[PDB]
């Protein structure tokens, strides 16, 4: 029947990958060259804009590495965008750009440098801008990707991200794809844009809403200053507690009870 | 013709007659080190005395 | 003690009683003063060396040995090494330990039996 791969000799020999390599979330060859700084700069922070896109949410952060672990300085998240205007389509391309503006303008209002670095930057006797690097992650770096949508939001927000590079931006290409289903197929418009009809925003409105989204983000960027954080964290456990409790651990006494009742069927008790 | 190739019998004896600890003059070695660091370390000293 | 473990074949040693620590220093005791190996003679020798350390006369020096008080190593360094003659029984076997029917190494209390006849 051929060789059994996976003996004791296999599993004893087997080195594991780290953890977030196993869970398959970080490339550690990226990360080790994202973090590194020259030893002549010593203990100096350099910031990195994380911008990972799940389904529904576009997440965007600014991170400093430390030996204990990474530390977010400021965060923004596309489920906040209902407050500023954008009710639906929270992983659009224009939704990804809108989070880019939030991460910029919140970070600069925390550091108290809002009057400086208003527009994009594009050189002496002038204050140098924030170096913030892009962490993409395992998402593939192709042109017109939603990772670089978050980048363009951060650059137009304020921050000097280095790169080499207004359609797709105020709701175009969404708005054209509405018209192709609306005009021809009609059945498919009900499938594809169910929620949109429900509001209903319509094809034309996408251009209008985003501009006033970019107005309101630039005016009132920071939000939800909650304290203390401990009593906030306690309320979330009660608020989001499964109705059905998770199975809990059997103690060492009641395990040996159940072991023996199985062993009574096949004989030779009791022990372990 | 064929005589001995080497020995270490009484290497130890000779070394211990005198293993003198050669002391370093100073910890900086300015032939080495970064020039960009030492360049600035000159302009620290030059600016101070004026 | 761990130094004495290395050198156990070369030495006999033990734990002397107060009558033996006395009788060495009165008879054979000498002061190594300024690297001179001077004989102890009179108590004005050891007042001048050791009076600042509160050891006035030879009774106070002997006390500082057998009680092992705070200025022991001052009082021990002050004493020159003793010089003994080979004892009037002889002794059996240089090159075996006392424990295996010989001489060298630790003999605990019975060093007093050896030193009596070395003196």
């Amino acid at each position: 029947s051929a060789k059994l791969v996976k003996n004791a000799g296999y599993f004893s020999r087997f080195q594991t990958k780290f953890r977030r390599r196993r869970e398959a979330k970080t490339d550690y060859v990226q990360r080790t060259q994202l973090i590194q700084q020259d030893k002549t700069k010593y203990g100096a922070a350099k910031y990195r804009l994380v911008a990972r896109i799940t389904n529904t949410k576009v997440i965007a952060q600014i991170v400093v590495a430390e030996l204990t672990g990474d530390k977010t300085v400021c965060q923004a998240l596309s489920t906040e965008l209902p407050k500023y205007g954008i009710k639906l389509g929270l992983s659009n391309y224009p939704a990804a750009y809108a989070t880019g503006l939030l991460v910029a303008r919140r970070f600069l209002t925390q550091m108290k440098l809002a009057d400086v670095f208003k527009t994009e930057i594009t050189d002496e006797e002038n204050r140098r801008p924030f170096k913030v690097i892009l962490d993409v992650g395992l998402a593939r770096t192709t042109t017109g990707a939603k990772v670089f949508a978050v980048m363009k939001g951060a650059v137009d927000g304020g921050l000097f991200i280095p790169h080499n590079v207004q359609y797709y931006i105020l709701g175009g290409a969404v708005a054209d794809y509405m018209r192709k289903l609306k005009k021809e197929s009609e059945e498919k418009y009900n499938k594809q844009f169910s929620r949109y009809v429900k509001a209903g925003i319509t094809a034309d409105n996408l251009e209008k809403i985003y501009k006033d989204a970019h107005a309101a983000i630039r005016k009132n960027p920071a939000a939800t200053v909650i304290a203390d954080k401990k009593k906030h964290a306690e309320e979330m456990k009660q608020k989001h507690a499964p109705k059905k409790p998770q199975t809990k651990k059997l103690s060492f006494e009641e395990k040996r009870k159940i072991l023996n009742e199985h062993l009574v069927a096949a004989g030779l008790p009791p022990r372990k | 013709a064929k005589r001995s190739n080497t020995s270490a019998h009484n290497r130890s004896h000779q070394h211990h007659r005198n293993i003198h600890k050669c002391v370093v003059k100073k910890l900086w070695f300015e032939k080495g080190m970064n020039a960009k660091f030492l360049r600035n370390a000159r302009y620290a000293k030059a600016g101070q005395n004026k | 003690i761990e130094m004495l473990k290395r050198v156990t074949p070369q030495v006999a040693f033990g734990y002397p009683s107060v009558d033996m620590v006395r009788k060495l220093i009165y008879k054979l005791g000498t002061a190594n003063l300024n690297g001179q190996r001077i004989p102890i003679a009179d108590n004005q020798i050891i007042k001048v060396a050791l009076g600042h350390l509160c050891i006035e006369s030879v009774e106070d020096l002997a006390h500082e040995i057998y009680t092992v008080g705070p200025n022991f190593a001052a009082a021990n360094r002050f004493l020159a090494v003793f010089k003994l003659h080979a004892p009037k029984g002889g002794y059996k076997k240089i090159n075996r330990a006392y424990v295996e029917g010989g001489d060298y190494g630790n003999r605990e209390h019975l060093i007093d039996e050896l030193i009596e006849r070395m003196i």
Binding site: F14, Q15 | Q14, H15, K21, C22, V24, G32, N34 | -
Partner: protein, 158 residues
């Protein structure tokens, strides 16, 4: 056939322990060094750019230069008669912060804790110091288990 190569007689030096193959964690690159710092050189077998020699494995030194990826380390090799100094350059992935001084630095701060707090009450100070392991005070011992060990009669058991 004795050979004088660079990487010679290092079969087991530059081996990678066991279940510790691969590149190191990126926490290692985030660490920092200074001039005057005591550091021990032990090698990553994987990372080949900017190794030390075989000889300066397991060898303490002091940092004198620091440079973008690498640290100039002063280490005292024993030559023939005399102990020479050797100016190494070596990368940070073969270099760790040594815990030689951490016994000494613990005591100095522990002494200042004692020397100040004696004066705060004040009162009057006893002086602590290090001392080798010393012979015991007399004391009294009651056990209530006493076995009686004896040699048994010998039997072969094969």
């Amino acid at each position: 056939g004795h050979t004088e190569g660079l990487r010679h007689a290092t079969r087991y030096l530059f081996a990678r322990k066991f279940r510790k193959h691969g590149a190191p964690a990126p926490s290692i690159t985030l660490r920092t060094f200074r001039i005057g710092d005591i550091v021990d050189i032990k090698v990553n077998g994987a990372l080949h750019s900017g190794m030390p020699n075989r000889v300066y494995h397991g060898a303490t030194g002091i940092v004198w230069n620091v440079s973008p990826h690498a640290v100039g380390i002063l280490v005292k090799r024993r030559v023939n008669n005399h102990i020479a100094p050797k100016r190494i350059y070596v990368r940070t992935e073969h270099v760790f912060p040594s815990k030689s001084k951490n016994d000494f630095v613990a005591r100095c701060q522990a002494n200042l804790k004692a020397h100040e707090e004696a004066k705060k009450a004040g009162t009057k100070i006893a002086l602590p110091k290090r001392l080798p392991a010393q012979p015991r005070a007399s004391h009294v011992v009651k056990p209530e288990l006493i076995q009686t060990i004896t040699d048994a009669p010998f039997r072969e058991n094969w």
